[PDB]
Design a protein around this ligand. Structure first.
Ligand SMILES: Cn1cc(-c2cc(C(=O)NC3CC3)cc(Cc3ccccc3)n2)nn1
Length: 111
């Protein structure tokens, strides 16, 4: 059983995983496979990896106790992208676009 605010969070999560946003959301679907992508410095730079499949598992397991906790993981995911990558990288442009979707809908949280 999810609170009203956590149902809004679950709605946002479903939207971020939906075909509507797939053109720029796909790098965030699964944990970064550093070894597969040849990013051998990734886990030296990013101490707390996060991705939408991990957010989905935590939501399904009722790990998040409130909207703030959910938003902290979604923002951690974007912050990791902005920390690791040069600001002109294609993946950063995709992060910016998905974060715009997130922030504008998160701002419509019911009181
Ligand atoms: C979530 N995530 C993925 C990546 C990442 C980082 C790199 C990368 O080589 N970064 C430079 C700094 C060393 C490459 C890719 C693959 C790729 C390429 C073009 C467009 C979307 C994805 N994804 N970062 N964070």
């Amino acid at each position: 059983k999810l609170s009203e605010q956590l149902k809004h969070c679950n709605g946002i999560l479903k939207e971020l995983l939906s075909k509507k946003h797939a053109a720029y959301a796909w790098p965030f679907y699964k944990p970064v496979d550093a070894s597969a992508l040849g990013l051998h410095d990734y886990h030296d730079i990013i101490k707390h990896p996060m991705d939408l499949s991990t957010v989905k598992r935590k939501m399904e397991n009722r790990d998040y106790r409130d909207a703030q906790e959910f938003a902290a993981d979604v923002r951690l995911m974007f912050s990791n992208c902005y920390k690791y990558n040069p600001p002109d990288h294609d993946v950063v442009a995709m992060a910016r676009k998905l974060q715009d979707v997130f922030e504008f809908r998160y701002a419509k949280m019911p009181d």
